[PDB]
Amino acid sequence: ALAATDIPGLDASKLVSGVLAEQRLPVFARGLATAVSNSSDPNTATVPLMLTNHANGPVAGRYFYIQSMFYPDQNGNASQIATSYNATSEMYVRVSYAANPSIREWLPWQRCDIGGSFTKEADGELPGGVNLDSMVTSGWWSQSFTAQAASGANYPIVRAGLLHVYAASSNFIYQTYQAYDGESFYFRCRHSNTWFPWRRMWHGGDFNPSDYLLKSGFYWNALPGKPATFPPSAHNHDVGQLTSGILPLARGGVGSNTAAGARSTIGAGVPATASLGASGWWRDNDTGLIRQWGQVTCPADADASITFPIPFPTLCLGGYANQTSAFHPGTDASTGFRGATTTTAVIRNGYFAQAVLSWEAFGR
Amino acid sequence: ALAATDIPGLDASKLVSGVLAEQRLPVFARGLATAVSNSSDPNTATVPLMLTNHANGPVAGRYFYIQSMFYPDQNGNASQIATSYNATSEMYVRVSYAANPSIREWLPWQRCDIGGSFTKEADGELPGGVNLDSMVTSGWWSQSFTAQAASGANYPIVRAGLLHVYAASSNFIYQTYQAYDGESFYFRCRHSNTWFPWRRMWHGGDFNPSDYLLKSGFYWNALPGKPATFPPSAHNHDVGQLTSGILPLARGGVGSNTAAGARSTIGAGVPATASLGASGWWRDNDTGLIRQWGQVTCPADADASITFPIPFPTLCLGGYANQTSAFHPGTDASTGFRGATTTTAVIRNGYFAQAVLSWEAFGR
Amino acid sequence: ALAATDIPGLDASKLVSGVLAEQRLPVFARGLATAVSNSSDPNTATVPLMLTNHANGPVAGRYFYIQSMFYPDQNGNASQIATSYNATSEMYVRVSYAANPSIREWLPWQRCDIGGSFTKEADGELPGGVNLDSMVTSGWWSQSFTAQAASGANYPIVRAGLLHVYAASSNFIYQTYQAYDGESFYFRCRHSNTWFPWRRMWHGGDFNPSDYLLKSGFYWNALPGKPATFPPSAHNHDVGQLTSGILPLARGGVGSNTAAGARSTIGAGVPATASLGASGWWRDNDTGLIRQWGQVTCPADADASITFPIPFPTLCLGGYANQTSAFHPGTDASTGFRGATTTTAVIRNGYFAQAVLSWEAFGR
Ligand SMILES: [Ca+2]
Ligand SMILES: [Ca+2]
Ligand SMILES: [Ca+2]
Ligand SMILES: [Fe+3]
Ligand SMILES: [Mg+2]
């Protein structure tokens, strides 16, 4: 009976049929990350799969499965894909390329999973009680509940809304917040670990500048509600500015616009008129009484007629005559006034010689 | 003479040279995703490559190729990379780690292709006719034509511009729009399937607050255009405030500032004056007429001189005398008045005895 | 001794123990990308690993390692993962699916690393001297120093701050800038290689609209500081608005509110009164002088008493009588007036017949 020790070394071509049992394969070809110790340096990888927490992996302190692909041999250029062993689901990629492929020049790991990016799904829903000062990593988050903004801290407004964080660096953490109801849009920055105040955008829902007065519209003629007239300050006047009415006696006026009315107000009379010649008259125009006078030559013991300087308008009321000469006192030298009309009267001379007699008459 | 049945079981070390035909390999080592049925659970994977649409894959209802990497054996902890079988090009990663590695604890799948991210390339160009209410998927899009905004619906402004969509959830869809010409920046949100109005940012192109009147600038002294004088409302005056001019008769005045002028205006006379004693005088100061009177003791049949109480300024015009006694009526008792100057006259007594005669004279 | 040429072809099941030397594996199972040439076409891939710069790879001109996973066989549907060979660390994925799997239909390569995405890490820190017009690639950058903004160009404000770039297309490059201190938020766009000016957001740190006057608050009654009285413009009055005071003669008044005082001011007299009948009286009310007259029938050579029309208030100053008839001139016809009281007097008739004598009397 033949034993294995009798069989010489064979070329792989001697296997002409069948599929090898998986245990016959090097472990990396079964997907087992067990060919090298779990602290192996991925920089010196020569098998296509290892598991290691070595520092040259993508995240210091963490184990990653590291796939390697090689050209032109397992010591040469390589591409590596790293996937996480626990805690999170992450992927990284890197490459070594060099003119002498065996003297590797590794580039830094580049992240593949979208955990390293701004994602089309929000990073998370914010629960209650969140202090936005604690949101210091880049991303965007949704607060779906106004009451959870109320129970949190450093929200710019008590409203559901969208938070963006742009963590530029440790000393410049930018945030924006868009309120769900458009209350406004806010922004702030943590600068060297101290937060600036939120800035609140002014928008068209807040106010319309057309509701406010331009400086160019601020002037007297534009001011509505102005009264037609204004209560005056103390002032004097020229009498010319008195243009209607009639001043009464109570104010030192004559209470009339006619001379007659004025005279009645102050109880005044009118001027008398006269012609005060040798033959003359005088007239009281208050009453119309007229007195007249003249002289006449009379014959001895006889009459002479006189004509009054002016006619009496209605009648002569009376008269007398007087001897103007040095009549002989041994005889009568009587006089008479009689027969008066509106225009004439008769003067009687009782003296026994031609004589000049003066006379007076009165009437109306 | 040797057939295969004569050869004993061999150790893999007996293959000392050559490269196996790939058909000798388990199918997963050939890139063939055929080792397990295409509905197999990736959670229970033990081969490094499978193809399955099982629900525990990354996208519901879709086939993915799933690569698996294991430690410390194929039943233990694992890392998996899923890649799509059709429709789109997508990649995912996940991991199972457990203290007892055979009791797996899988973490959620994380996406790797940039389809899950906001990318440096815009998501698309918006054509004409787009209703922005329909843009409810996260991303950013560009409208390159104002005319294509004009043919659409629910653009905040008819302008080319940049649309961001942040679909936090179907209950909260946020949008922003930046007009290409800086007309403004807009934001809004769809809450519970109803869109709030676009909010429009106010910016420096719209207005400058310095053009508007501050409340603190609104007061009487600052109001420009105020008139120097104002139309007065109805008011009363004291006559003392009439400081110039002369009131005319039409207004109840006397049309003059002199006594004589005032009398002229109202046609008034002046007072008569008198001394009304037993001998006396009376003067009409309107005309200048003077009447005087007195008494005189005359000698029998002779003259007596009289002196007028006051001189006549110019001349005596006339006079008479009257017997004051009970003269015997059997003789003449005539009288005469004659020879009058401005100061004196001659009274003649025709009675045969001494007698008292009264007299009157008038003149001017 | 047996030679290898004596051993017949063997089934893979003849290996019952041990692990193959890795050099017995097809090269791709070792991670060696050498099974096909570096010009091989990935569209026609039948091996699970290659390295090629063929045009059908993900980036023209560049070598990528390409893994292939196949179903149902190596000519059929396939998923491919490509990882970079040099220069950078990049990954892509694609797929071929067709109802007839051998007539392949390849979908476009899709990037898997975050290098083509908006990353949670900022693209970079801006140094000094940067012209922001040069930043036309999508991303976000941080200016950590205000002094480095001051040395640059086309910053919207000389302030540290956060720059975003959205390069929608060559014809539209959008930028936003958030100041670190919240000075404001800015945006602009480069359209057809011309940058619009930055727009500057108005926010609550800039001003508050409640400091400005609403047009609805701009009216007369609301204006503060208004005087209580106003200097009047020229106006006229009705004398009815002269409610107090007494106009003096200097202003055309009578200087009094009594008739007597007004007369005194202008030196006017009062009206005379009279009863100008056949017998009657006349009275100068300036002085009180009264004149009266009448007629009386006397016996021959005898007295007759008269009663004055009215009593003299104080005394009769004088009188006379006059013959009214054509007395015989051959005799005496003297008259007398005497014995006057306030009410009566005595008229003497020296004519030797009954005769009518008229009389006058005066007094006060
Ligand atoms: Ca005688
Ligand atoms: Ca005679
Ligand atoms: Ca006788
Ligand atoms: Fe006035
Ligand atoms: Mg008078």
Author numbering:
A (entry chain A), B (entry chain B), C (entry chain C): 328 to 691
Q: From the publication, what sentences describe this entry?
A:
Morphologically and functionally, the R-type pyocins resemble the contractile tails of Myoviridae bacteriophages. Attachment of the fibers to the target cell surface causes structural changes in the baseplate that, in turn, trigger contraction of the external sheath, which drives the internal rigid tube through the host cell envelope. The killing mechanism of the pyocins is not specific to Pseudomonas, and their spectrum is fully determined by the fibers. We found that both R1 and R2 pyocin fiber fragments form a ~240 Å-long homotrimer that contains a rod-like and a shaft-like domain, two tandem knob domains, and the C-terminal lectin-like domain.
The iron-binding site has an octahedral geometry and is composed of six histidine residues—three symmetry-related copies of His561 and His563 in R1 and His562 and His564 in R2. A similar triangular density is buried in the N-terminal part of the Shaft of the R2 fiber (residues Phe534-Tyr539), but there is no such “molecule” in the Shaft domain of the R1 fiber. In the R1 fiber, the grooves start at the threefold axis and extend radially outwards whereas in the R2 fiber the grooves are connected at the threefold axis, creating a “supercavity” at the tip of the fiber. The calcium cavity of R2 is located on the interface of two polypeptide chains and is much deeper than the sodium cavity of R1, which is formed by residues belonging to the same polypeptide chain. The calcium ion in the R2 structure takes its origins in the cell cytoplasm as the protein was never exposed to calcium containing salts during purification or crystallization. In the structure of the R2 pyocin fiber, ethylene glycol molecules that mimic various parts of the LPS bind to the Knob2 and C-terminal domains. In the latter case, the interaction of the ethylene glycol molecule with the protein involves calcium ions, further supporting the role of calcium ions in binding to the LPS.
